[PDB]
Write a protein that binds this ligand. Structure first.
Ligand SMILES: Nc1ncnc2c1nc(Br)n2[C@@H]1O[C@H](CO)[C@@H](O)[C@H]1O
Ligand SMILES: [Mg+2]
Length: 390
């Protein structure tokens, strides 16, 4: 009579990392890619012979900086003249060109100079997330919910849908990232009455705070605040500067001019930073870092906390601003939700908990997975086609 329907997927199309989930058997499965990773870098690389997407693109970035594209989400739906675009271009090793006041990324690919619109690069990331899902389900996937930041305008939302259409996905809906994180915790299933929810989203490069009101499952965005110059990469930079100084003291050598040594140092720092979220100390062990000198050292969580102390405290300024904009007091917030890998930092959790007078933080769903989790819950709801009984 009626063939079984394929599952719909939920995609968190992130600035630095993307995540895909599917709701089946009353639960969400976050789908790992073929290298066993539950999140996939939003990177696309171009060579004379291949186009690489995800981990394969990010793993070859050091020697191919001009032809490895990342951060397309910062360009999507924006004009070339937009002041945000002009400032961001100074930090990118790839070329951004002007095509009718619309930015395009220009690379060497298969023997030619090729330019792509940001939605075309995002469609390549979406094609990889669709293939990750089809490898797990064992059949072709058509339907998806894709998330966007709450501050995205109409042009940014339409370009995200366009990226989905290019990838061969039927876009069921574009939903806000803070709404998806709230849905992940079932905060829209608590029945009658108003609930105020604060979403605290600390990413690789930016920080976003959102205040939502939920009434009978209806979401209203009350306030958004944040810091475009605060993320995980700033904490990595503080460790980098600390270890460059430490090498100077110990071996009387300045390593800061050998890109390879700095890159090996930063890669090691990011991993030490992750270890410090679970351990009270972490070792750093690099062989022949500079002039054949082995760099074997350690860092305590207390020293790391001191190195980033001002940056961690500054996350509370957009929280107070969002609360003023929403015209609410901190005691009036019913639920606190953590989003982003950087929220695993114990000190970040402690500062926010202390600000909300000891309140529990919702962090049981991996913070780097909560947005895709909620998007997958919504995708399964949107494809239901139940006919009422008499
Ligand atoms: N356990 C963790 N503790 C501290 N930081 C983390 C952790 N896991 C992730 Br993921 N991150 C950071 O989150 C950002 C995501 O773009 C990057 O800066 C990652 O370094
Ligand atoms: Mg995100």
């Amino acid at each position: 009579g009626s063939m079984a329907k394929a599952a719909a997927i939920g995609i968190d199309l992130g600035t630095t990392y993307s995540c895909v989930g599917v709701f089946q058997h009353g639960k969400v499965e976050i789908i790992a890619n073929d290298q066993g990773n539950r999140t996939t870098p939003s990177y696309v690389a171009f060579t004379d012979t291949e186009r690489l997407i995800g981990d394969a693109a990010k793993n070859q970035v050091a020697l191919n900086p001009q032809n490895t594209v990342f951060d397309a989400k910062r360009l999507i739906g924006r004009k070339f003249g937009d002041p945000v675009v002009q400032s961001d271009m100074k930090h990118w090793p790839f070329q951004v060109i002007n095509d009718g006041d619309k930015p395009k990324v220009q690379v060497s690919y298969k023997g030619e100079t090729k330019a792509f619109y940001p939605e075309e690069i995002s469609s390549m990331v979406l094609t990889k997330m669709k293939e990750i899902a089809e490898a797990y389900l064992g059949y072709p996937v058509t339907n998806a919910v894709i998330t966007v930041p709450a501050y995205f305008n109409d042009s940014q939302r339409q370009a995200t849908k366009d990226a989905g259409v290019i990838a061969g996905l039927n876009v069921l809906r574009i939903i806000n990232e803070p709404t998806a994180a709230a849905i992940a915790y079932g905060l829209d299933r608590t029945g009658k009455g108003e609930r105020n929810v604060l979403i605290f989203d600390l990413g690789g490069g930016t920080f976003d705070v959102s205040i939502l009101t939920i009434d009978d499952g209806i979401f209203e965005v009350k306030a958004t605040a944040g810091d475009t110059h605060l993320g995980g990469e700033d904490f990595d930079n503080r460790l980098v500067n600390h270890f460059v100084e430490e090498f100077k003291r110990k071996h009387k050598k300045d390593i800061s001019q050998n890109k390879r040594a700095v890159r090996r140092l930063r890669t090691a720092c990011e991993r030490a930073k992750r270890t410090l979220s679970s351990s009270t100390q972490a070792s750093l062990e690099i062989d022949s870092l500079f002039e054949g000198i082995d760099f074997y050292t350690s860092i305590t969580r207390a020293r790391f906390e001191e190195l980033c102390s001002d940056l961690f405290r500054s996350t509370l300024e957009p929280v107070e601003k969002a609360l003023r904009d929403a015209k609410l007091d901190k005691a009036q917030i019913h639920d606190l939700v953590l989003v982003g890998g950087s929220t695993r930092i114990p000190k970040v959790q402690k500062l926010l908990q202390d600000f909300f007078n000891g309140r529990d933080l919702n962090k049981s769903i991996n913070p780097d997975e909560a947005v895709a989790y909620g998007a997958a819950v919504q995708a399964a709801i949107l494809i239901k086609s139940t006919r009422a009984a008499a």
